[PDB]
Design a protein around this motif. Structure first.
Motif, PDB file in Angstrom:
ATOM      1  N   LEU A   1       0.106 -17.254  -0.020  1.00 35.73           N
ATOM      2  CA  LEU A   1      -1.304 -16.882  -0.019  1.00 35.73           C
ATOM      3  C   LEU A   1      -1.648 -15.932   1.130  1.00 35.73           C
ATOM      4  CD1 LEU A   1      -2.966 -20.218  -1.177  1.00 35.73           C
ATOM      5  CD2 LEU A   1      -2.164 -18.251  -2.523  1.00 35.73           C
ATOM      6  N   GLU A   2      -0.842 -15.954   2.187  1.00 33.46           N
ATOM      7  CA  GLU A   2      -1.049 -15.080   3.337  1.00 33.46           C
ATOM      8  C   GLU A   2      -0.829 -13.601   2.987  1.00 33.46           C
ATOM      9  OE1 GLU A   2       2.348 -17.399   4.385  1.00 33.46           O
ATOM     10  OE2 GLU A   2       0.865 -18.340   3.035  1.00 33.46           O
ATOM     11  N   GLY A   3       0.005 -13.336   1.988  1.00 34.47           N
ATOM     12  CA  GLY A   3       0.305 -11.962   1.611  1.00 34.47           C
ATOM     13  C   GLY A   3       1.519 -11.482   2.396  1.00 34.47           C
ATOM     14  N   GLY A   4       1.961 -10.257   2.143  1.00 33.78           N
ATOM     15  CA  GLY A   4       3.116  -9.729   2.854  1.00 33.78           C
ATOM     16  C   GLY A   4       4.461  -9.853   2.153  1.00 33.78           C
ATOM     17  N   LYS A   5       4.595 -10.840   1.271  1.00 27.81           N
ATOM     18  CA  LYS A   5       5.828 -11.098   0.529  1.00 27.81           C
ATOM     19  C   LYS A   5       5.448 -11.343  -0.931  1.00 27.81           C
ATOM     20  CE  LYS A   5       8.708 -13.521   3.718  1.00 27.81           C
ATOM     21  NZ  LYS A   5       9.110 -14.878   4.224  1.00 27.81           N
ATOM     22  N   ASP A   6       6.052 -10.584  -1.848  1.00 21.64           N
ATOM     23  CA  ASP A   6       5.709 -10.700  -3.258  1.00 21.64           C
ATOM     24  C   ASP A   6       6.596  -9.754  -4.072  1.00 21.64           C
ATOM     25  OD1 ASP A   6       4.171 -11.388  -5.522  1.00 21.64           O
ATOM     26  OD2 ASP A   6       2.437 -10.178  -4.957  1.00 21.64           O
ATOM     27  N   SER A   7       6.539  -9.882  -5.392  1.00 20.49           N
ATOM     28  CA  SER A   7       7.238  -8.953  -6.263  1.00 20.49           C
ATOM     29  C   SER A   7       6.219  -7.804  -6.433  1.00 20.49           C
ATOM     30  CB  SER A   7       7.612  -9.604  -7.604  1.00 20.49           C
ATOM     31  OG  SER A   7       6.526 -10.305  -8.185  1.00 20.49           O
ATOM     32  N   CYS A   8       6.596  -6.748  -7.138  1.00 24.76           N
ATOM     33  CA  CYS A   8       5.702  -5.609  -7.270  1.00 24.76           C
ATOM     34  C   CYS A   8       6.144  -4.725  -8.440  1.00 24.76           C
ATOM     35  CB  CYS A   8       5.751  -4.830  -5.953  1.00 24.76           C
ATOM     36  SG  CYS A   8       4.450  -3.614  -5.649  1.00 24.76           S
TER      37      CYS A   8
ATOM     38  N   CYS B   1       0.006  -5.933  -4.876  1.00 30.07           N
ATOM     39  CA  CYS B   1       1.229  -6.613  -4.482  1.00 30.07           C
ATOM     40  C   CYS B   1       1.104  -7.102  -3.063  1.00 30.07           C
ATOM     41  CB  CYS B   1       2.427  -5.661  -4.568  1.00 30.07           C
ATOM     42  SG  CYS B   1       2.647  -4.861  -6.155  1.00 30.07           S
ATOM     43  N   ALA B   2       1.541  -8.330  -2.842  1.00 29.61           N
ATOM     44  CA  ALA B   2       1.522  -8.917  -1.512  1.00 29.61           C
ATOM     45  C   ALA B   2       0.141  -8.960  -0.857  1.00 29.61           C
ATOM     46  CB  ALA B   2       2.519  -8.175  -0.618  1.00 29.61           C
ATOM     47  N   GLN B   3      -0.921  -8.975  -1.661  1.00 26.29           N
ATOM     48  CA  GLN B   3      -2.278  -9.032  -1.122  1.00 26.29           C
ATOM     49  C   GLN B   3      -2.616 -10.471  -0.771  1.00 26.29           C
ATOM     50  OE1 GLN B   3      -4.021  -5.925  -0.743  1.00 26.29           O
ATOM     51  NE2 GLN B   3      -1.867  -5.476  -1.220  1.00 26.29           N
ATOM     52  N   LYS B   4      -3.471 -10.648   0.229  1.00 25.04           N
ATOM     53  CA  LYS B   4      -3.869 -11.985   0.656  1.00 25.04           C
ATOM     54  C   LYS B   4      -4.574 -12.685  -0.497  1.00 25.04           C
ATOM     55  CE  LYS B   4      -6.386 -14.370   4.325  1.00 25.04           C
ATOM     56  NZ  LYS B   4      -7.198 -14.192   5.585  1.00 25.04           N
ATOM     57  N   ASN B   5      -4.184 -13.927  -0.751  1.00 25.32           N
ATOM     58  CA  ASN B   5      -4.760 -14.747  -1.812  1.00 25.32           C
ATOM     59  C   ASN B   5      -4.508 -14.269  -3.234  1.00 25.32           C
ATOM     60  OD1 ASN B   5      -5.847 -16.832  -0.131  1.00 25.32           O
ATOM     61  ND2 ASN B   5      -7.365 -15.319   0.545  1.00 25.32           N
TER      62      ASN B   5
ATOM     63  N   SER C   1       0.901  -1.140   0.000  1.00 27.17           N
ATOM     64  CA  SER C   1       0.000   0.000   0.000  1.00 27.17           C
ATOM     65  C   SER C   1       0.940   1.189   0.000  1.00 27.17           C
ATOM     66  CB  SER C   1      -0.867   0.025   1.261  1.00 27.17           C
ATOM     67  OG  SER C   1      -1.787  -1.050   1.251  1.00 27.17           O
ATOM     68  N   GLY C   2       0.813   2.050  -0.994  1.00 25.33           N
ATOM     69  CA  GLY C   2       1.695   3.193  -1.039  1.00 25.33           C
ATOM     70  C   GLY C   2       2.885   2.844  -1.901  1.00 25.33           C
ATOM     71  N   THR C   3       3.882   3.725  -1.905  1.00 27.16           N
ATOM     72  CA  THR C   3       5.040   3.532  -2.755  1.00 27.16           C
ATOM     73  C   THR C   3       6.369   3.896  -2.105  1.00 27.16           C
ATOM     74  OG1 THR C   3       3.648   4.042  -4.682  1.00 27.16           O
ATOM     75  CG2 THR C   3       6.002   4.212  -4.962  1.00 27.16           C
TER      76      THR C   3
END
Ligand SMILES: *C(=O)[C@H](CCCNC(=N)N)[C@H](NC(=O)N1CCN(C(=O)NC(C)(C)C)CC1)C(=O)O
Ligand SMILES: [Ca+2]
Length: 223
Positions: A166-173, A197-201, A127-129
């Motif tokens: 799937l929990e979110g929190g870690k991902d590319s963006c 990015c990093a959204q749940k599911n 959320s945000g940049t």
């Protein structure tokens, strides 16, 4: 990269930054004069930057080489992002050493559960940049195709795979696109798309490189 860590300068020697006056996408060096990236990263006037850590400071191990040509996959569909892969040829061959090295193409497709390394200079917030200046890394497992399809009904093709949590929190963006997903020293994916990015599911969706080895090899052999 959201929820990752600072890689360490030149610890991901095959990671390149595509620059058109600013960094806009990542890429993977596959040999001294060819880079694989995402077709959605296509644009003219690309300068490939290798040996990069802080993309805003010249630190001493960089090699800036303009691209002589780009070849978007013949079946790339920008609406569905199917076949999201592109080859970029450097005007001159890069000087390969420990800090700048190519990554091998896979001989086999990686399976769900395989742990991989995803890297890039993209946004670090869901959320945000906030853009990091140094390379960020994320260790993430390839997810099952069923969970991938369940996460993105009617959108996952055989040329895509999900990787992440799937929990979110870690991902590319944003800003990581075109970059590498390396598993056991082989390039298995290209940062392609996802919902936010990093959204749940809503895990990251990556181009399935193993499906394109023949195309990559034949294209390089004739260009
Ligand atoms: C990639 O950086 C973005 C998707 C990352 C994966 N997300 C996730 N796992 N949840 C992608 N943005 C992106 O690549 N674009 C296109 C190329 N860039 C650019 O400068 N655009 C030009 C038109 C080529 C100038 C950066 C933005 C996305 O949001 O889908
Ligand atoms: Ca630099």
């Amino acid at each position: 990269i959201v929820g990752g860590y600072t890689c360490g300068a030149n610890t991901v020697p095959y990671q390149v930054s595509l620059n058109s006056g600013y960094h806009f996408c990542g890429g993977s060096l596959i040999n001294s004069q060819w880079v694989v990236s995402a077709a959605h990263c296509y644009k003219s006037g690309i300068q490939v930057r290798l040996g990069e850590d802080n993309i805003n400071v010249v630190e001493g191990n960089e090699q800036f080489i303009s691209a002589s040509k780009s070849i978007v996959h013949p079946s790339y569909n920008s609406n569905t992002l199917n076949n999201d892969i592109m080859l970029i040829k450097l005007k001159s061959a890069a000087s390969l050493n420990s800090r700048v090295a190519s990554i091998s193409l896979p001989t086999s497709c990686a399976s769900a559960g395989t742990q991989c390394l995803i890297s890039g200079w993209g946004n670090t917030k869901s959320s945000g940049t906030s853009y990091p200046d140094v390379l960020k890394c994320l260790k993430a497992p390839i997810l099952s195709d069923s969970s991938c399809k369940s996460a993105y009904p009617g959108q996952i093709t055989s040329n895509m795979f999900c990787a992440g949590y799937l929990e979110g929190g870690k991902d590319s963006c944003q800003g990581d696109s075109g970059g590498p997903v390396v598993c056991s020293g082989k390039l298995q994916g290209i940062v392609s798309w996802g919902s936010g990015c990093a959204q749940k599911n809503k895990p990251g969706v990556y181009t399935k490189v193993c499906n394109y080895v023949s195309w990559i090899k034949q294209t390089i052999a004739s260009n």
